[PDB]
Design a protein around this ligand. Sequence first.
Ligand SMILES: *[C@@H]1O[C@H](CO)[C@@H](O[C@@H]2O[C@H](CO)[C@@H](O[C@@H]3O[C@H](CO[C@H]4O[C@H](CO)[C@@H](O)[C@H](O)[C@@H]4O)[C@@H](O)[C@H](O[C@H]4O[C@H](CO)[C@@H](O)[C@H](O)[C@@H]4O)[C@@H]3O)[C@H](O)[C@H]2NC(C)=O)[C@H](O)[C@H]1NC(C)=O
Ligand SMILES: CCCCCCCCCCCCCCCCCC(=O)OC[C@@H](COP(=O)(O)OC[C@@H](N)C(=O)O)OC(=O)CCCCCCCCCCCCCCC
Ligand SMILES: Cc1ccc(-n2c(-c3ccccc3)nc3ccccc3c2=O)cc1
Lengths: 116, 52, 132, 168, 48, 105
Amino acid sequence: IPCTLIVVLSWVSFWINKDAVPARTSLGITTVLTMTTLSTIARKSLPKVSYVTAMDLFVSVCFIFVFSALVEYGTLHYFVSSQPARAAKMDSYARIFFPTAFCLFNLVYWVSYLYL
Amino acid sequence: MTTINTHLRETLPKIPYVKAIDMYLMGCFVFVFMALLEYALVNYIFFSQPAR
Amino acid sequence: SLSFKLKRNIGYFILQTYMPSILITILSWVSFWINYDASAARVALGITTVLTMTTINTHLRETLPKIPYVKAIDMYLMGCFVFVFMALLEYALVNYIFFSQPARAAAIDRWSRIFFPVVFSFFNIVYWLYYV
Amino acid sequence: VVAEDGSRLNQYDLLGQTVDSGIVQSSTGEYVVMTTHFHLKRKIGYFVIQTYLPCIMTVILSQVSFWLNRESVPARTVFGVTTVLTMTTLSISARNSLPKVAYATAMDWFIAVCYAFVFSALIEFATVNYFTKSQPARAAKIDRLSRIAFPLLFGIFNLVYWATYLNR
Amino acid sequence: ALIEFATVNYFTKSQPARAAKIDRLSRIAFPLLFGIFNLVYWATYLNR
Amino acid sequence: NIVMTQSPKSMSMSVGERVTLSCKASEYVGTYVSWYQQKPEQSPKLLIYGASNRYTGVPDRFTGSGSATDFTLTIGSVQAEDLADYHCGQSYSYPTFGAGTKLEL
Ligand SMILES: *[C@@H]1O[C@H](CO)[C@@H](O[C@@H]2O[C@H](CO)[C@@H](O[C@@H]3O[C@H](CO[C@H]4O[C@H](CO)[C@@H](O)[C@H](O)[C@@H]4O)[C@@H](O)[C@H](O[C@H]4O[C@H](CO)[C@@H](O)[C@H](O)[C@@H]4O)[C@@H]3O)[C@H](O)[C@H]2NC(C)=O)[C@H](O)[C@H]1NC(C)=O
Ligand SMILES: CCCCCCCCCCCCCCCCCC(=O)OC[C@@H](COP(=O)(O)OC[C@@H](N)C(=O)O)OC(=O)CCCCCCCCCCCCCCC
Ligand SMILES: Cc1ccc(-n2c(-c3ccccc3)nc3ccccc3c2=O)cc1
């Protein structure tokens, strides 16, 4: 629950006005630090095994999602100066491609692991 | 970087020398610090030369 | 029966929990010297101060037992947190009336500059005469 | 006699040993006591990396905020608050390794001076911002003086501290 | 609260009246609902 | 080795007075210094062992003190039979002796 809630919090950035740079930057980076703290705790639950468990695959995918949101904002802001239409449509495209990808990953993950 | 180092140092004992992981964390810190100093330099000198 | 009367030395706690929170409250007061035109700066000060106080508390409580009643150190930390929170709420009040009437907003900032340190000193005197 | 390979000391160095013999008067009589003293010198490396370098780094970062433009109030405010927060975290962390003694150690004094420098930098910024838009000349002058004074004072303090604590 | 601010910012500079309306409604709704929840929660876990 | 510097080289005092002989150790010797009285054409006699411990048959006026590197032997109210040489030695390590101290009137 905390990891997915952090992921949706990262999504929230896609609706913030593209002009407010400090707001969205801080949103993304704070999401990242919260993600790393959560990963540390979750892995600290169990012994130090070198292989990948189902829990830390989930946490790693959540971290990738938050990182994707932050880098996406960075690229959008960079393209503002070059091409306005590119960034304008990029925001809306991300708004849909992020939640759909997360729902799809959830479906795959839970189907594979619960039915095993 | 500070909090990652903090969480790491808890597990190990207190040894006088630097471990490979400690040297890696130092390097990553120094790179982040240098990026911050790069922005500091850019901001200091921008008002004079916008091209520099 | 052999009994011992132990008096606890306080210097360690001055170094560990009392001085940091006092300094964090002093930091909180800086917000009133910053122009009330700046929202990001003042909110940064207030929020960072609140969170630093919470960090002080969380690190402190990890070394005591789960006790029902309020300890004196708990009283001090709660009061300091209330002071930091009041600084943040005062800034919010200023920001609510910034555009409509900057004169009264400046008056409120000035009064805060005067009366946060004074009320803090009164609270400190009450606290340190109640226990000491 | 101490065995050559027999050292389980992580944080200390065994300089040598001393023996003596004496007498102690107890409540049951006069007893011979044999004493050995093992002389140990603590290794500073762990504490250098874990406290001294972070504190110096936070001081450097706090002073780097002077070179920023006065037209960036949020940025310098973030610098000040985050440096103070880092100093508080470091001060809470440092003591956790030592017993809860009632006096200040050399590390405590170093951290106190570093906290003072971070706090002073933030107050200098507050003053500069206060004098901005009314007396810009004064604000710029004090910022320019600070850019030299703060690093030099920190360096002089470091020289004195290390000289007086590495020669005792 | 975060979602409400996001909605306000989305609707700002396009429908300012709507943004002001939702903001001034939330200012009364959120404390009221939190107080109602607190009262119910404490009444049900203490009257027991 | 461990050098035991004994001073003064010589000294004279009448009968009835208090004197203090001193012996300095180079390194640390703990309380492992002994004091010896050697009358002319005779073998040494142990007076003080440990650092402050009168050997059996030693009058109560002789008394030793000191620890670590500094040691002293105070002869309170010297008599006429206290004229001799006085050697300090350390037994912390392989023994070393001070150069000696002659006592005249
Ligand atoms: C740490 O904590 C412990 C435990 O709480 C304390 O120990 C208590 O110490 C006090 C005083 O040292 C003890 O009180 C003493 O009780 C004695 C017996 O009481 C009988 O007589 C009284 C009436 O006088 C009856 O009410 C009672 O029921 C008993 O029948 C008294 O004799 C003692 O002297 C009293 O009387 C004489 C009369 O000449 C007076 O001069 C005295 O001043 C005094 O009034 C005294 O009252 C108490 O009992 C202890 N507790 C326990 C559980 O034993 C330690 O004091 C406390 N501090 C430290 C440093 O350890
Ligand atoms: C592990 C569990 C974690 C779960 C986390 C997920 C949380 C999901 C929780 C999701 C709930 C999020 C609530 C925040 C949304 C704010 C309202 C909004 O965005 O839309 C309302 C809009 C529609 O009306 P209009 O358009 O203004 O009409 C006039 C004209 N424009 C026209 O349409 O003609 O404006 C309003 O009316 C504002 C009143 C609602 C404010 C909040 C009260 C309810 C919640 C108040 C407080 C909510 C309580 C929540 C707690 C239960
Ligand atoms: C292994 C290791 C140990 C310490 C640090 N560290 C360094 C720091 C100090 C010198 C060189 C590189 C980083 N600064 C800091 C500044 C502020 C807060 C924490 C740190 C910190 O935790 C990073 C990694």
